[PDB]
Design an enzyme around this catalytic site. Structure first.
Site, mmCIF file in Angstrom:
data_model
loop_
_atom_site.group_PDB
_atom_site.id
_atom_site.type_symbol
_atom_site.label_atom_id
_atom_site.label_comp_id
_atom_site.label_asym_id
_atom_site.label_seq_id
_atom_site.Cartn_x
_atom_site.Cartn_y
_atom_site.Cartn_z
ATOM 1 N N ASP A 117 18.849 124.912 -62.357
ATOM 2 C CA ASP A 117 17.758 124.044 -61.853
ATOM 3 C C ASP A 117 16.811 123.886 -62.989
ATOM 4 O O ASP A 117 16.193 124.874 -63.465
ATOM 5 C CB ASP A 117 17.125 124.684 -60.674
ATOM 6 C CG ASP A 117 16.203 123.734 -59.911
ATOM 7 O OD1 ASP A 117 16.583 122.547 -59.793
ATOM 8 O OD2 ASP A 117 15.200 124.252 -59.416
ATOM 9 N N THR A 118 16.666 122.644 -63.422
ATOM 10 C CA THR A 118 15.635 122.302 -64.379
ATOM 11 C C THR A 118 14.357 121.867 -63.624
ATOM 12 O O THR A 118 14.424 121.350 -62.549
ATOM 13 C CB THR A 118 16.092 121.140 -65.323
ATOM 14 O OG1 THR A 118 16.503 119.975 -64.589
ATOM 15 C CG2 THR A 118 17.233 121.547 -66.275
ATOM 16 N N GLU A 164 11.483 119.340 -62.470
ATOM 17 C CA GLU A 164 11.538 117.873 -62.312
ATOM 18 C C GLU A 164 10.629 117.268 -63.383
ATOM 19 O O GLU A 164 9.753 117.971 -63.909
ATOM 20 C CB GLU A 164 11.135 117.403 -60.891
ATOM 21 C CG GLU A 164 11.967 117.979 -59.720
ATOM 22 C CD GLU A 164 13.401 117.394 -59.559
ATOM 23 O OE1 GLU A 164 13.615 116.197 -59.860
ATOM 24 O OE2 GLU A 164 14.324 118.148 -59.119
ATOM 25 N N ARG A 183 26.700 113.204 -55.482
ATOM 26 C CA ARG A 183 26.705 113.638 -56.875
ATOM 27 C C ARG A 183 27.877 114.515 -57.168
ATOM 28 O O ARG A 183 28.197 115.372 -56.394
ATOM 29 C CB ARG A 183 25.388 114.335 -57.265
ATOM 30 C CG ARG A 183 24.187 113.487 -57.035
ATOM 31 C CD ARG A 183 22.891 114.176 -57.425
ATOM 32 N NE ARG A 183 22.723 115.381 -56.647
ATOM 33 C CZ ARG A 183 21.685 116.193 -56.735
ATOM 34 N NH1 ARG A 183 20.704 115.943 -57.604
ATOM 35 N NH2 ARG A 183 21.717 117.324 -56.095
ATOM 36 N N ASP A 230 19.012 118.154 -65.258
ATOM 37 C CA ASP A 230 20.236 118.646 -64.591
ATOM 38 C C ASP A 230 21.100 117.564 -63.938
ATOM 39 O O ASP A 230 21.977 117.899 -63.170
ATOM 40 C CB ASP A 230 19.923 119.825 -63.636
ATOM 41 C CG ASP A 230 18.903 119.466 -62.618
ATOM 42 O OD1 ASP A 230 18.798 118.253 -62.346
ATOM 43 O OD2 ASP A 230 18.230 120.389 -62.118
ATOM 44 N N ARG A 286 25.585 116.309 -60.954
ATOM 45 C CA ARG A 286 24.584 117.374 -60.912
ATOM 46 C C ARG A 286 25.191 118.648 -61.493
ATOM 47 O O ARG A 286 26.294 119.079 -61.108
ATOM 48 C CB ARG A 286 24.134 117.566 -59.487
ATOM 49 C CG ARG A 286 23.249 118.709 -59.154
ATOM 50 C CD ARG A 286 21.877 118.502 -59.799
ATOM 51 N NE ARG A 286 20.864 119.453 -59.339
ATOM 52 C CZ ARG A 286 20.704 120.702 -59.805
ATOM 53 N NH1 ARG A 286 21.496 121.234 -60.727
ATOM 54 N NH2 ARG A 286 19.736 121.456 -59.297
HETATM 55 C C1 LIG Z 1 23.361 122.300 -57.686
HETATM 56 C C2 LIG Z 1 23.660 121.971 -56.239
HETATM 57 C C3 LIG Z 1 22.742 121.289 -55.482
HETATM 58 N N1 LIG Z 1 23.046 120.931 -54.202
HETATM 59 C C4 LIG Z 1 22.031 120.295 -53.355
HETATM 60 C C5 LIG Z 1 21.230 121.451 -52.764
HETATM 61 C C6 LIG Z 1 19.832 120.868 -52.673
HETATM 62 O O1 LIG Z 1 19.653 120.227 -51.376
HETATM 63 P P1 LIG Z 1 18.173 119.557 -51.020
HETATM 64 O O2 LIG Z 1 18.125 118.190 -51.625
HETATM 65 O O3 LIG Z 1 18.329 119.416 -49.545
HETATM 66 O O4 LIG Z 1 17.098 120.424 -51.525
HETATM 67 C C7 LIG Z 1 19.785 119.849 -53.793
HETATM 68 C C8 LIG Z 1 19.134 120.343 -55.081
HETATM 69 O O5 LIG Z 1 19.407 119.353 -56.061
HETATM 70 P P2 LIG Z 1 18.191 118.921 -57.048
HETATM 71 O O6 LIG Z 1 17.716 120.177 -57.736
HETATM 72 O O7 LIG Z 1 18.800 117.896 -57.985
HETATM 73 O O8 LIG Z 1 17.185 118.328 -56.158
HETATM 74 O O9 LIG Z 1 21.104 119.562 -54.158
HETATM 75 C C9 LIG Z 1 24.314 121.328 -53.635
HETATM 76 O O10 LIG Z 1 24.581 121.021 -52.456
HETATM 77 N N2 LIG Z 1 25.245 121.941 -54.373
HETATM 78 C C10 LIG Z 1 24.972 122.296 -55.660
HETATM 79 O O11 LIG Z 1 25.810 122.945 -56.310
HETATM 80 CA CA LIG Z 2 16.097 119.890 -60.383
#
Ligand SMILES: Cc1cn([C@H]2C[C@H](OP(=O)(O)O)[C@@H](COP(=O)(O)O)O2)c(=O)[nH]c1=O
Ligand SMILES: [Ca+2]
Length: 130
Positions: free
Chosen positions: A35-36, A38, A76, A16, A30
């Protein structure tokens, strides 16, 4: 109401996230609404492989921002990403390699499209849904 904009692949990262050059600047994107697993989790490798192939085989990559936040808290970019006109976000869901996830109000234009794909993946018992 959303618009596709140009980009070029710099480097596949994982299911992702991807490194793309956008308006001439290197950015990690991102993928919205998904959500893929990890890379170290189950179907993580398969998800990364899947996106690496989509991105690298594409002639034309494009970025489509939604109506909200365009960057997350880690800097991102938040977008729908297209490989030769096919949305990577939706393709992942449709193959059972991502779940619909992280649906925040005002960056959720393609929510229902993706949920339809998830329902079809789940019905076909694909990958994550197997
Ligand atoms: C997809 C997405 C993730 N995020 C943030 C939320 C999550 O915060 P946390 O890092 O605090 O968990 C994290 C999940 O991304 P990842 O799945 O790449 O880790 O990215 C956003 O803020 N907006 C979005 O649209
Ligand atoms: Ca992920």
């Amino acid at each position: 109401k959303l618009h596709k904009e140009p980009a070029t692949l710099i480097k596949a990262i994982d299911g992702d996230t991807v490194k793309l050059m956008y308006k001439g600047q290197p950015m990690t994107f991102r993928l919205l609404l998904v959500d893929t697993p990890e890379f170290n989790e189950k179907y993580g490798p398969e998800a990364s492989a899947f996106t690496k192939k989509m991105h690298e085989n594409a002639k034309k990559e494009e970025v489509e921002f939604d109506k909200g936040q365009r960057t997350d808290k880690y800097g991102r970019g938040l977008a729908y990403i297209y490989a030769d006109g096919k949305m990577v976000n939706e393709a992942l869901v449709r193959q059972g390699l991502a779940k619909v996830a992280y649906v925040y109000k005002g960056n959720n234009t393609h929510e229902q499209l993706l949920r339809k794909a998830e329902a079809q993946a789940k019905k076909e018992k694909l990958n994550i849904w197997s």
